[PDB]
Amino acid sequence: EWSYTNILTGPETWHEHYKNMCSGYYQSPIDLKTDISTLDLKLKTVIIYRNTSSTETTTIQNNGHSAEVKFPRNTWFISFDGILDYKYEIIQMHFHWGNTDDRGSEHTIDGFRFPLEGHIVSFRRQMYSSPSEAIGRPGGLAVLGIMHQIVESIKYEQTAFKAYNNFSGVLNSQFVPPNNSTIDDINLALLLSLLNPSRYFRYLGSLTTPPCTENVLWTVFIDPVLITREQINLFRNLPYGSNEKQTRMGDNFRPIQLLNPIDTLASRTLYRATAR
Ligand SMILES: *[C@@H]1O[C@H](CO)[C@@H](O[C@@H]2O[C@H](CO)[C@@H](O)[C@H](O)[C@H]2NC(C)=O)[C@H](O)[C@H]1NC(C)=O
Numbered sequence: 484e485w486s487y488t489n490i491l492t493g494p495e496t497w498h499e500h501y502k503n504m505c506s507g508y509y510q511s512p513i514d515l516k517t518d519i520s521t522l523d524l525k526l527k528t529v530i531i532y533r534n535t536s537s538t539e540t541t542t543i544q545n546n547g548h549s550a551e552v553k554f555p556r557n558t559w560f561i562s563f564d565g566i567l568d569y570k571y572e573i574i575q576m577h578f579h580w581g582n583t584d585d586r587g588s589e590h591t592i593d594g595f596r597f598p599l600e601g602h603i604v605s606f607r608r609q610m611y612s613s614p615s616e617a618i619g620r621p622g623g624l625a626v627l628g629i630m631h632q633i634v635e636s637i638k639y640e641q642t643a644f645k646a647y648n649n650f651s652g653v654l655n656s657q658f659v660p661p662n663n664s665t666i667d668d669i670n671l672a673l674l675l676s677l678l679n680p681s682r683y684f685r686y687l688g689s690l691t692t693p694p695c696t697e698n699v700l701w702t703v704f705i706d707p708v709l710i711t712r713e714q715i716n717l718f719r720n721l722p723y724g725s726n727e728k729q730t731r732m733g734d735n736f737r738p739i740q741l742l743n744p745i746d747t748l749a750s751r752t753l754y755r756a757t758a759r
Pocket residue numbers: 534536537538556557558569
């Protein structure tokens with residue numbers, strides 16, 4: 484019973500209706516301000532890698548809040564240390580977009596919004612057994628933020644949707660909550676190859692939907708990948724759930740939180756990584 488577009492249940496009210504932890508002071512998203520961040524040269528190239536023995540199918544769903552891809556377990560992994568040892572396991576990827584092309588992202592970079600931001604959501608497997616072990620425990624989750632930029636005269640194999648395999652055509656008016664659906668696997672490593680994975684912001688924050696748990700190690704890449712107007716619009720075709728005042732899914736993004744609200748009891752820092 485939280486929403487984006489229903490003013491009685493909308494984001495301004497989350498800190499009240501879900502105090503744990505939407506009222507905390509390590510919230511996301513934030514404005515990633517290049518000039519107010521500490522470069523940390525010890526932060527390494529992000530690697531995404533697959534368990535090739537995994538053969539289980541990949542699905543997608545309209546959950547009422549986003550278009551969410553649910554990946555099978557033991558399939559997709561993140562490494563932040565160059566070691567391929569299954570420390571972080573990808574669970575799910577979802578998206579945040581606007582009603583118009585000029586907004587939709589949750590994070591901004593130096594004040595700039597983007598039309599679409601994806602989240603690849605993983606659990607700290609080195610510490611926790613399963614996704615549901617992780618989701619509510621401290622230091623449980625690591626999420627990647629991927630910016631998308633709208634481009635016009637471009638070949639399809641150079642857009643993100645190639646990596647998404649175009650969501651196996653599943654995106655349309657018909658796709659309704661909570662109807663799941665089978666698709667071909669997203670090539671996440673290809674997706675990553677389309678930006679620069681040594682260049683990102685890094686900080687401790689939260690889930691950007693209630694209950695806003697403060698257990699996300701955030702990584703947001705600096706360089707956007709590319710989409711067409713045709714491509715973005717397939718998103719706006721999905722219907723929202725019953726809880727929303729708007730009909731067509733959009734503006735499903737949370738307003739900007741402060742890095743350090745004045746009532747914080749231990750400030751946090753925004754870090755930034757760069758190549759070689
Ligand atoms: C890679 O995937 C394989 C196959 O999906 C995983 O092995 C299976 O899952 C568990 C082992 O933990 C057992 O129930 C089965 O004996 C295995 N079955 C198959 C199909 O081989 C494997 O553990 C995965 N590896 C990682 C690191 O996640």
